[PDB]
């Protein structure tokens, strides 16, 4: 309808780069977590799993898991996995010391 949406250059993946991540992915949820790591490494240094970030990940995920266009599928599979990955990473860091 409205516009062409592209992400900022720094968060733009090539089709080749996307295919590669997918090929290593065990599931839609794992693909989502790999994408979090590749797109947003700043989120892991010294939460901001905010809506724009999550939507970008979902847009990539949908290229190969089109059922993720259903918001129920997104919320049942990918979104809890992303949040639990992110929580686990941060608690692991908190515990180091």
């Amino acid at each position: 309808m409205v516009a062409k949406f592209q992400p900022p250059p720094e968060y733009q993946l090539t089709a080749a780069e996307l295919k590669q991540i997918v090929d290593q992915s065990l599931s839609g949820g794992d693909l989502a977590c790999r994408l979090l790591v590749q797109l947003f490494p700043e989120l892991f240094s010294d939460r901001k799993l905010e809506s724009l970030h999550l939507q970008l990940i979902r847009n990539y995920v949908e290229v190969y898991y089109p059922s993720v266009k259903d918001t129920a599928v997104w919320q049942a599979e990918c979104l809890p996995q992303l949040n639990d990955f992110f929580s686990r990473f941060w608690a692991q860091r908190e515990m180091e010391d």
Partner: protein, 57 residues
């Protein structure tokens, strides 16, 4: 072949951070070692893209 664990991600990310700093400093030996340890966890075009194992020596 396998789900990325948060442990793996953390190691991957620290390796890339340090490989970049090593490159900034000029220690290509350390950078090469670190980028490779990253590649072993989570291979991708950007990391494999060093390489740039240039020498002239």
């Amino acid at each position: 072949a396998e789900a990325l664990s948060p442990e793996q991600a953390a190691h991957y990310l620290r390796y890339v951070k340090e490989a970049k700093e090593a490159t900034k400093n000029g220690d290509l030996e350390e950078a090469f070692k670190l980028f490779n340890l990253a590649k072993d966890i989570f291979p991708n075009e950007k990391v494999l893209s060093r390489i740039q194992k240039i020498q002239e020596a």
